[PDB]
Amino acid sequence: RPGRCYRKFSGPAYTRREYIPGIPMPKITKFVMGNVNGDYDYELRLITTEKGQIRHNALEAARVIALKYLSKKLASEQNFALVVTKYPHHVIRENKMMAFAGADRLQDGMRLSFGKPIGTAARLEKLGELVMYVRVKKEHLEAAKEALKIASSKLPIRTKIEIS
Amino acid sequence: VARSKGYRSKTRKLLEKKVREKGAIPKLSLLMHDYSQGEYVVVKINPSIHKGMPHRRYHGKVGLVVGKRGKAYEVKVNIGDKERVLIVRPEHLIPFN
Amino acid sequence: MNELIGVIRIRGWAATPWYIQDTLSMLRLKNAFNAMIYPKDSSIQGMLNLVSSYVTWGELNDEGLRLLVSKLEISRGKKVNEEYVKDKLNVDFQSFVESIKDGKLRLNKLDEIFSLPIRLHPPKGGFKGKVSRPFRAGGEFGYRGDKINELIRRM
RNA sequence: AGGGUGUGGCUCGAAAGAAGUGAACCCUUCCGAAGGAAAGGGGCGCAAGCCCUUAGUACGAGGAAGGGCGAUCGGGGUCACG
RNA sequence: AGUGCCCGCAGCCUAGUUUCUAGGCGAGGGGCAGGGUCUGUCAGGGCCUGAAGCCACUGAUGUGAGGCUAGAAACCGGGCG
RNA sequence: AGGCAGCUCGCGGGGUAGAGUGACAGAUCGGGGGCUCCAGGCGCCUGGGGCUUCCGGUCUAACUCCGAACCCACGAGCGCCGAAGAAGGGGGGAGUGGGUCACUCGGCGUAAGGUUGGGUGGCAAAAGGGGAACAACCCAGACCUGGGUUAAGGCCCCAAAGUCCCGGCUAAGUGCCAACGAAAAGGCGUCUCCAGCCUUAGACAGCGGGAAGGUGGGCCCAGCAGCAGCCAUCCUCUAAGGAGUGCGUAACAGCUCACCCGCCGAGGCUGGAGGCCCUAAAGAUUGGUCGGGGCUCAAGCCGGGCGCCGAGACCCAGGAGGGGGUCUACUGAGAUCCUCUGGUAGGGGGGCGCUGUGAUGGGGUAGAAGGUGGGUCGUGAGAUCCACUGGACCCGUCACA
RNA sequence: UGGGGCGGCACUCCCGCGAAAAGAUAACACGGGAGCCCAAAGGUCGGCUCAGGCGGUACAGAACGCCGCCGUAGAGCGCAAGGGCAAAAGCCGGCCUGACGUGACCCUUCCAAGUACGGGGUCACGACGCGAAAGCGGGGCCUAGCGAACGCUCGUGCCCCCACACGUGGGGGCCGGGCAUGACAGAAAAGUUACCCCGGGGAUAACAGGGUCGUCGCGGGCGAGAGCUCACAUCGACCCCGCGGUUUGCUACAUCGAUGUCGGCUCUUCCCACCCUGGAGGUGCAGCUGCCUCCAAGGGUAGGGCUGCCCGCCCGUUAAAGGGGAG
RNA sequence: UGCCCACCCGGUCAUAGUGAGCGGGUAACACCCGGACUCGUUUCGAACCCGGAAGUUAAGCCGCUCACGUCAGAGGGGCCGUGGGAUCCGAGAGGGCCCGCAGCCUCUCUGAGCUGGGAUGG
Known part of the structure; x- marks a missing residue:
């Protein structure tokens, strides 16, 4: 189902x-x-722009792509650490009954059209909320920029970056 | 889905009491004072006391002492454009103003 | 904050919300282009705030007040046995300020107490004299300080 | 397409409507609602304009008088165009 | 069973009418009453009781009769094929 | 003789928005410390399992230690209606029980001119002006005629008035669209704005040279003679250079990269955001647009501004009618004052016509009736009249059916 | 009843949520319950304080008992939920039967603004029971556990039974209780009609518009991976953002006193997301054959077999034998 | 004098609490003495009940100090709403702006028992 x-x-x-x-x-x-509790210097974070809900499916894909890009960069235990903030607390529900029952003259239509649990989302309620962030040293901010940015390519909503 | 018209229906926190005043009836001082005709009172249901509990539909309002029957009082309150009498024990009554 | 306040209604009486439609009625503002004077107080303040998006109000001056009053006509008078007489002189006062007023037998001395609804005239040169929408806050609907005096002088 | 509507053109108009005891049409004088100018003058603003004055004046919807003219108007039908 | 208290309109009287709820009288009316009755063992509770309806015309509406008008498949009796 | 659709003050009620989770209930991510058990390796260490503590973060319609705006009760006050037109009580007669849409706060569902809720507004039953036409969008509630001023909108022509002004931006006809019509990304394409870094102790760019050597050190490698697979690294040195960047090469070699010098005398460079614009961006319903015409230092957009046109809203003038507060009449007619003026379901008030009955100052008829056409009265309902035709019976008034 | 049937009961009553801090407030919304059970699980009085954790003691054990310490409820209170509760409503004993008769008013039912039941509260009179007492007790800590007329039966003290009275029997009335209707505000109630019929219905199904786009086709972003090295020649996984209204899902706004329904035949036209033909380019393009991008709708885009079609499989040529619209 | 100091009877119901340390008692208050009678311990004079009353400030009680809990004040930080209006921006979601109001958490610092009715003690 489309995002x-x-x-x-x-x-x-x-x-x-x-x-x-x-x-x-x-x-x-x-x-x-990454090596949490490791020594890091650059403190860049990730910020969203508009409201909405993000499906976990994309996030997990976003999780994988970020790791490989960093993993090939220096290492997986090296002087870097990736932590995603949100959790898929929210749950989506969809009236799938139009698929199975929608072809056998059963109670089709909007009849009993309450949704059914098929997926989860990490809820966004504040303008400019953290989604993930990464901690590095002074010498690798350049690789970290697109590293977040390439992850942001898959997110449904417009995102923002910063440097700290 | 129509909701049941239970006498305490839809009261999940209406009868919830702030934890600072749980237990048996503390405020004896309010009860001991006695009412006479023409007095003005405020109804504040005590969820703890199960005796003479007025219905939720008239909570937190202005009441008038019109008489006395037994250990309890009866109270006149305007709700719409009608008149009604609420016979209640005093332990949900607080003087106005 | 001065005692002498006034109001002019510029909106019509259709599409008028239940909240407010009777308020101007209670404010005796049956229909636009009307006015009267009130003693300022917190109790009055509530109406003007609630009716702000329909009228314009503020503090008068001497020039406005004298101009405002001079408009009472054959059907725009004091509550002198109804009749809305045309004041036109102390004469109508001279025979009829002896009912509710005391000591006000001079046309100039109406700076204290009360009045009735008055039928206004359209503002000259367009109410949209420099504005185009009648619904800007701070410029169009509600409170306008002394500037209401010139606004009525145009009237 | 249609009708009502304004301006006209052309047509019928014996009586039944006005009207020679004055229609229709011209002037002249007067009153005047709200409303409401302009030229000039001076000043201000880059400009676009405004401000006081000229002035609630000229003007004006409506209404009054006089005169001059002299017999059709009102009315019906159609058509032109708005 | 059909009375007894009180507030109080119009009108009246009073002097001022200063211009008049200034006060009385107060029909009507309203509120407390009371009474008759059954029921309850008392409070009570239900009902009735403060002296006016009948008749006639027209009118309106409800109800019953075809029931504003028109509109069915139906069923039955008796005949005729 | 008070009444209360509003507001203010005073005085009460509240668990929603929000916020918090070590305050319960749950959900949920990690690290640190200690305790405990197991596996492996050399009593120790590593990994895993369980427990505790500390520290950090992520959510809650069915969590609430807290908690607004806000809404509501009552008293007082303000304000308005009230004896011209009256709180309560009684009585006659109804239609109405399929709503819809716009806005706004929900739920369901992605969705829907979908459905289902709270509040407001129309519309339904609301004309008049704009939006191109239009039930619902805005202005604004039509007794009538006339005059004037104004609203929402608009002001190049169609079509009333601005080819109106300042400043700036757009090259696509982008656009000339409130209710309606394009996402993520890409653009130094353009137009303005924040950072950071070098710049007259000569900036960037540009133009030639030195641009180097023990050494091509090198390890394994025929050779890798930076650049075959791991990688260090000193002075000959100084206004200059690395034990050295990309091309490369079997291996070289070589061209360059990094640095200074010679000219050079104005800024230059890198992250940032925004506006407009281009791609993204493709449907025919049959045929090309913002309404078209047509418009490009705009007849577009943005910041602003200035001046006008514009309705039945408002002001005025004249007439009309209802309702309410003085006069005459064997029972309807006058004067004056105030005021009210969209309209279905519905209720109510009053008025004309048709045919007959009783009457009826009464009357009318061989010159009626009726028809045709046309005057005049009356808001109308209709009345009433004149020419002709007709050729024998017909109205006015009241009451009644 | 988002056509009807099937489905289910949202049809009787209750908890929370829905529901937006007054009240009321819809959903075939969500998470759940009831058609009981208790002579003690009831009344009162009295006594003790729980879950859990820590230390020490034979059997002894994390958890049988015992002695100390902490333990604000984390237990428990009959049944679902919500709430309430600590010298108690909890736990343990004593005595009891008020789970009382009769007659009341009032709350919810059922807001404002009508009303059956049911439940509940406050009473008086009388007698009880508990405790010394105040006092508390007409059921269960509070919120679900339930049934009109008519008829039948039961208890109650009388009342009435005839156009004459009286006697006996037998009947009738009250007032209250039980005998039921879950479609639970109360008819006694099985299927088909495609042989059907009737009055209607666009308040409403089927084809056919409109809206929408789960699906469908397409596009774009990004780029794990494959390609000898090299992501982007070509393939692009996980994801993300867009378009079309070609089918297919819902919508019932229009059509039920008819808009006559599939295909095919003939015939016209349109569109471009280009099948070929034209132009240009890249390529892991020696040339041919390739593969791919872009522009370009002027023209063309067959003939057969099986299948009624569409779809689909295949035959032999051709430049290929493009796909869609126009009710 | 006195008034507060405790006590009995309280109201407020944590700013009044908990825990630790220390200080105060010849009265008051307890601790503490003993049970034959009253009553009473499903054993016990433990406790309760009664009779008492030597000692004693160690408990408790009381005051004070320090901690935590807890109410406020201020500061720092965290986080962020809502009514009223527009042919305002944005396709929407959303947001700004003019008219009215705010509060929420978390750290720092500063306070933190009040009071009615009567018999002892100063």
């Missing part, structure tokens, strides 16, 4: 697991990469 289907907000959040049975397992499993 344009869940970009905006359709109703409130969706969080209580005990109230919402059967959540598909999110793609993301690891959230921290």
Whole structure:
């Protein structure tokens, strides 16, 4: 299903697991990469621009692409560390019934059209919220710029970078 | 989905009490003072006391002491353009102003 | 903050929200191009704030007040047994300030107490004299300081 | 396409409507609602204009008087164009 | 069973009418009453009781009769093929 | 004789927006310390498992230690209506129970001129002006005629008024579109603005030279003689140079890279954001546009500004009608004052016509009736009249059916 | 009832959420419950304080018991949820039956603004029970656990039974209780009609417009990977952002006193996301054959077999035998 | 005198709490003495109940100090809303702006028991 289907907000959040049975397992499993507690100098972060919800599926892909670019750069345990901030707390639900029941004269249409859990999203509620960030030294900010930027290529929403 | 018209329906925090005043009835000082006709009172339901609990529909309002029956009082309150009488024990009444 | 305040309505009486439609009615502003004077107070302040997006109000001056009053006509008078008489002289006062007023038998001495609805005239040269939309805050609807005096002088 | 509408053109107009005890048409004088000028003068603004004056004046919707002219107007039908 | 308290309109009277809720009288009316009745063992509770309807015309609406007008497949009786 | 659709003050109620999670309930990411068990390796170390503590972060319609704006109750005050037109009580008669859309805060659902909620507004039943036409968008509530001023909008021509002004930007007809019509990315294409770094102790660019050597050190390597696979590294040195960048080469060699000098005397360079514009950007319904015409130091856009046109809204003048507060009449007619003026379902007030009955100062008829055409009255409903035709019966008034 | 049927009960009552800090407030919205159970799980009085954790003691054990310390509820309170609760509503004992008779007012049901039940609250009269007492007790800590007329039956003290009275029996009435209707504000109730019929319905299904785009086709961004080295000659995984209204999903705004429904035949036209033909280029282009990009809609784009089609498979040529629209 | 100092009877219901340290008692308050009678311990005079009362400030009580908990004040930092209006910007989501209001968290510093009714003690 296309990413344009869940970009905006359709109703409130969706969080209580005990109230919402059967959540598909999110793609993301690891959230921290690199030698945390390692010595770093440049302190660049990532900032979003407009509101919305981001599917975990893209994020996990964004997680992988960032790692390989850095991994080939120097190493995976070297003087760098990647940490993604948000978590897919939000859950999306879709009326899939038009697929199976939508061809057998069952209760089709908007009949009983409550959504069904198929994916999760990391919710964004503040203008300019952190999504991920990376810590390096003085000598590798240039590689870190596009490293975030290439990840941002896959994000659904417009993003912003900074240097610190 | 129509909601049940339970006598305490939709009260998840209406009858919630701030933790600082839990337990049995503390404010004995309010009760001991006695009302007479023509007095003006404010209804503030105590969720703890199960006796003479007025319905939620008239909570936090202005009441008038019109008489006394038994240990309890009866109170006149205007809600719409009608009149109503609420017979209640005093332990949800606080003087106005 | 001075006691003598006034208001002019410029909007019509259709598409007027339930909140406000009766307020101007309660403010005796039945329809646009009308005015009257009030003693300023917090109690009055509420209406003007709530009716700001429909009228213009501010503090009068002597020049405006004298000009404003001079307009009472055959059907625009004091509550002198209704009739909205044309004041036109102390004469109408002389025989009829002895009801609610005391000591105001001079046309000049109306600077204290009360009045009735008055039917205004369109502002000369266009209410859009320099404006085009009647709905800018700080320029169009509501409070305009002394400038209301020149605005009514155009009237 | 149609009708009402303004200006006209051409047509019927015996009575039934006005009208020679004055129609229609010209002037002249007067009153005047709200509203509302301009030339000139002076000043200001790069300019676009405004400000006081000229002035609520000339003007004006409406209404009054006189005169001169002298018999059709009102009305019906069609058509031109707005 | 059909009375007894009070507020109080119009009108009236009073002097001022200063111009008049200044006060009385106060029909009507309103509120507390009371009474008759059944029921409740008392409070109570239900109902009735403060002296005016009938008749006639027209009118309107409801109800029942075809029921503003028109509109069906239907079913039944008796005959005729 | 008070009433309350608003506001203010005073005095109360609240768990929503938000915020927090070591304040519960859960969700959820990591590190540090200590304790414990296992596996491996040489009592130790490593990895894994469980426990604790500390530190950090990520969410909650069904979490709330807190918590607004806000909305509501009551009293007082303000304000308005009120004995011309009246809080409460009773009574006759209804239609109305399929709404829709716009805006705004929701839910469902991606979505929908979808559905389903809260509040407001039309529309329905609301004309008149603009938006090109238009139920709903804005202005604004049509007793009538006339005059004037104005609104929303617009002002080159169609079509009323600005080829109106200042400053700046756009080259695509981008555009000339409120309700409606293009995303991410790319653009130093252009137009303005923040950083940072070198610049007259000569900046960038540009033009020639020195641009180097023990040494092409080199390790394994025929040779890699920087640049075959790992990598160090000193002075001959100084206004200059690396044990050295990309081309390269089997291996070279060589051209360059890095640095100074010679001229050079104005800025130059790198991250940043924005406006407009280009690509992205492709559908025919049959045929080309902003309404067209047409427009390019604009008839576009942005910042602003200045002046006008524009309706039935408002002012005025004249007439009309309703409602409400004085006079005459064997029962309707006058004067004066105030005021009110869109319109279906519905209620109510009053008026003309048709045919008959009773009457009826009454009357009318061989010159009626009716028809045709045309005057005049009346808002109208209609009335009433004149020429002719017709050839024998017909109206006015009141009441009644 | 987002046509109807199938589906399910959103049809009876209750908890929270929905629901936007007054009230009320929709969904075939979400997460859930009830058609009971308790003579004690009830009333009162009295006594003790829980879950859990720490230290020491034979069996002894993390957890049977015992002695100390901490433990603000993290336990427990019958049943779902919410709330409430610590000398208690919790736990343990004593005595009891008020889970009382009769007659009331009031809240919710059922806002403002009408109303059956049911539940609940506050009473008086009378007698009880508990405790010394104040006092507390007409059920369960509070919020779900339920049924009109008519008829039948039960208890109650009388009342009435005839056009004459009286006697006996037998009947009838009250007032309250039970016997039920879950479609739960209460008819006694199985299927087909494609032989159907009738009045209607665009308030509404099917084909056919409009909206939309899950799907479909296409485009673009980015670039793990393959290509000998080299991401971008060509392929591009994971993702992201856009277009078209060609099918296909929903929408019911229009059409039910008819817009006559698939295909095909003939015939006209359009569009470009170009199949070929023209122009230009790149290429892992010796040349041919290739592969790919861009511009370009002027023209052309067949003939057969199987299948009714569409689709699909295939035959032999051709430049290929492009794809879509126009109800 | 006195008034506060504790006490009994309280109201406020944590700014009043908890924990530790120290100080105060010949009265008051407890600790503490003993149980035959009252009553009473599903053992016990533990506790309760009764009779008491030597000692004693160690408990408690009380005051003070320090910590934490906790109310406020200020400072720093965190975070950020909402009514009212427009043919305003933006396709939308969203945002600015004029008219009215704010509060939220977290660190630093500074305070942190008040009070009615009666018999002892100063």
